[PDB]
């Protein structure tokens, strides 16, 4: 039907509904017509306290009758956002709220546009589509706010394996930087990544601006069967196997790649390169280990 | 007068761009093979240099 | 209503898709065949180099 809702400020908003509905699900129709959560709403008509869910037609409420809306100053949950100036602001939230919802409320209080907003909780940046309950953000937690600078944006990278990841970037960033950020998130070394936007292969050395890559753009990621550097390892049997490695790979990094192939636990592996034993904290580079160098694998008997 | 054609066109548009990604993924598998053949070719050449030194061990 | 202008042409271009997937699979195993060959050669190099060490060592005893 059609009923009216007048706050004490005189404002009358109006939507349609049927008498079968209850008090509880009307508030949910109020929240997306001008924007007030249901834990801040209390409805009155004819001095009968409308209590969260005895049928509308149980209170005798007909079409065209006007309801009275009262508003709490406060919901059930507050969080605090610390700004880089040292200003701390207070937000009214529900655990169901998305980080984009939280961003809109920050715009409402402070004028900062959402696409310029970066939010950090417990050293971890929070992504637009997840909720406060997903990050374990509870009553009275403090988020930190960082503004994007220098045209800064988020972009998305998509593989064929379905995975869609989000990246924090700037237009000055090069394709190599983007790949490095993909490495930092996903473990994939950059010499195994190729990136496609529109239908151009993205050249190392060019920047996001060069390819005209704007906010919330989507790049596609394709993975190579091999990088640029392989080394050979000799098995316990005595077969050669090949490893995709980088000079900054650590020796624990190399042992794991051997476990993937020979299934020998890393705490059981001993790696020799031209007489010397490879120590765990160390990299390939520190040992003067080149492409196509050969290592020997021996057990530790622990 | 229903136009879920929009929904099925939009389901094709994704599938289309996926193909070009598949294509590009195919090109990458192609260039990798070549790098691998060049690697195989280079180590065969190294094997041929030892074989020589063996053959020549008398003179 | 000329939606059908495209929905049908879409399926013919998308036929090509499985030809790519099949060609992907083949280039893949072709790559593994080459790397296998390279590994084998790497082993043959070790046998040759062992052959050389033994001939030289036993020429000097």
Author numbering:
A (entry chain A): 1 to 302
B (entry chain B): 443 to 501
C (entry chain C): 445 to 505
From the manuscript:
Optineurin (OPTN, also called FIP2 and NRP) and A20-binding IκB proteins contain a UBAN domain11. OPTN consists of multiple domains, such as leucine zipper, LC3-interacting region (LIR), two coiled-coil (CC1 and CC2), UBAN and Npl4-type zinc finger. Unlike NEMO, OPTN does not interact with IKKα and IKKβ13; however, OPTN suppresses NF-κB activity by competing with NEMO function. Thus, we concluded that OPTN functions as a linear ubiquitin-binding protein through its UBAN domain, and that linearly ubiquitinated proteins, such as RIP1 and NEMO, are important candidates of OPTN-binding.
To clarify the molecular mechanism of linear ubiquitin recognition by OPTN, we crystallized the human OPTN CC2-UBAN region (residues 416–510) in complex with linear tetraubiquitin and determined the complex structure at 2.7 Å. The asymmetric unit contained four OPTN CC2-UBAN monomers, which form two parallel coiled-coil dimer structures, and two tetraubiquitin molecules. Although we used the OPTN CC2-UBAN region for crystallization experiments, the electron density for the majority of the CC2 region in all OPTN molecules was very weak and thus we modelled only the UBAN motif with some extensions on both sides (residues 445–505 for the longest chain). In the crystal, the third and fourth ubiquitin moieties of tetraubiquitin bind to one side of OPTN-UBAN in the same asymmetric unit, whereas the first and second ubiquitin moieties bind to the other side of OPTN-UBAN in the adjacent cell. Thus, there are two OPTN–diubiquitin complexes, composed of one OPTN dimer and two diubiquitins, in the asymmetric unit. The UBAN domain structure of OPTN·diubiquitin superimposed well on that of NEMO-UBAN·linear diubiquitin, with a root-mean square deviation of 0.72 Å for 62 Cα atoms. OPTN-UBAN binds to diubiquitin in a similar manner to that observed in the structure of the NEMO-UBAN·linear diubiquitin complex rather than that in the NEMO-UBAN·K63 diubiquitin complex. The distal ubiquitin is recognized mainly by hydrophobic interactions, with additional polar interactions. In contrast, the proximal ubiquitin is recognized mainly by hydrogen bonding. The Glu478 side chain in OPTN hydrogen bonds with the Arg74 side chain, near the linkage of the linear ubiquitin chain, in the distal ubiquitin.
